Amino acid sequence: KTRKLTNILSKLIDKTMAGTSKITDFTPGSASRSLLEAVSLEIEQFYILTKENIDWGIQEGIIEAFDFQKRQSKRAYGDVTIQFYQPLDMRMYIPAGTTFTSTRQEYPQQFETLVDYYAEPDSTEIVVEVYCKETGVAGNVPEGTINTIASGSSLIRSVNNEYSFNTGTKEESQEDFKRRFHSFVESRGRATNKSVRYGALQIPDVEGVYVYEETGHITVFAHDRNGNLSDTLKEDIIDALQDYRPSGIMLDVTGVEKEEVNVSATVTISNKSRIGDTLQKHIESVIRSYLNNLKTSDDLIITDLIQAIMNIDDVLIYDVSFDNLDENIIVPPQGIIRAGEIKVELK
């Protein structure tokens, strides 16, 4: 590990005294002591150089091999061209630090020239590179905005930038750099339920895909497009999932069906004076919304329905029963519960 100025200088002194018998004075001012101090300072600087290199390496250098790009807050820059009234007859000077102010009032962006340029004797046009003062995405400017120069001259006519500033760059944290790499590595998994689900969700118009697994066959069905699945999407997704399916295992894709439930429930209220059209309408709306929001292959347990309908208000409801619902309704894997016809009686 890195060692400081003091240790290196002390080792040099001790080794000089061990080797050299000529030299004995080490006051501040000896040519030899400051020769050693110069040597030590350069060594320490090289140690800090290696330290920074190791820091960069541990931070992103192993990941750089893989297909990802890193951003280092590079300020925006782009080619800009200037024009003059007549061809020049002198080698005009263009200082570094020259400011190209925005012509548009709404754009406070400004740019500066890092290196000096010397106009030719007779060239009517010259293109130079200009860097923005402000880093980040804010330094981006549309085409045809830079048309003013602070160090104006008689010969100068106008300025323009044909190409837009695309090199605007913003730097994120190490976590943001690592997360995309993780997502890419995780995405390379195949022949698994979660990986099949991700690969289905990669194609657009795929949402709420459900996977059912069996030793014999693997069956995938979804209600991605407005609650329905089309044949064309099935053909497209069958071909995509070939790379994701396990070798030697069959793959099958089918549509999603629904089972409309008919229920005529009865509710006893402790305080009969409270009953009214609004109350039973609200109860019917709550019941139908609860019955609509059911997960794929979710059995309609009467117990949950009882809990749901009673949890509206414990003081209000005293007793509940269903005339036309015997027990819980079991559904296949591809079936989903829907509200066909709901009626609520008040007792």
């Binding site: 800090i48 280092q72 300020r75 709404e106 890092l114």
Partner: protein, 212 residues
């Protein structure tokens, strides 16, 4: 807080830390504040053209913390990236209300004189840096001592000092202005450099020492 500096011809980064902070040892932490890659200071600008934002070359500015903020990691992180935005943040940011600069200088010590304005596009104008400090001194001077609805004993008795233009009134006005200007802790001192009379017109100027 910080001090400004510039890169001189073939000055080494060791030399700066030693001259300002005494010990050369501190340069190592001092390069992180100026966010520098290993060639921390390099003579040539066509060499700065390698990757411009991560280097300094001859003629470029540098940032020099005070020794207390030298070791603070937050000061390091902020000074690394903000660069020139230091001065603005350190003097602070505020809404610009010097819309009519020609006008407010025709009716001072009267109310209703300042007003929002618009710069850029679709956004109220804002002021920052030294301009902000001036504007704030200006507003403080042109406001009577007990007229803001909270934190009174703010402002001046300039509206009360109108008198027979004999010199004692002029020293009184000088002292009030100096008190008003020295109220803000950001300013170090004020001092008069001229007072001058033209019949019924006072004129004079004041120098104010603003912290770096």
């Amino acid at each position: 807080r910080f001090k400004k500096h510039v890169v001189q011809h073939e000055e080494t980064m060791q030399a700066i830390a030693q001259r300002y902070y005494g010990d050369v040892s501190y340069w190592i932490d001092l390069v992180e504040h100026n966010n520098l890659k290993y060639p921390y200071l390099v003579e040539t600008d066509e060499e700065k053209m390698k990757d411009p934002e991560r280097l300094a070359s001859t003629g470029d500015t540098l940032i020099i913390p005070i020794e207390s903020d030298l070791t603070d990691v937050s000061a390091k992180e902020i000074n690394s990236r903000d660069k020139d935005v230091l001065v603005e943040l350190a003097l602070g940011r505020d809404l610009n209300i010097t819309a009519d600069e020609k006008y407010f200088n025709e009716h001072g010590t009267s109310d209703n004189i300042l007003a929002f304005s618009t710069n850029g596009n679709g956004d109220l104008d804002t002021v920052k840096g030294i301009d902000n400090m001036k504007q704030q001194l200006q507003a403080r001077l042109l406001t009577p001592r007990g007229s803001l609805m909270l934190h009174p004993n703010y402002g001046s008795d300039l509206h009360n000092l109108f008198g027979l233009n004999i010199p004692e009134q002029a020293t009184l006005i000088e002292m009030e202005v100096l008190r008003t200007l020295t109220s803000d802790n950001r300013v170090k001192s004020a001092n008069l450099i001229d007072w001058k009379i033209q019949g019924n017109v006072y004129s004079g100027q004041f120098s104010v020492e603003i912290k770096s």
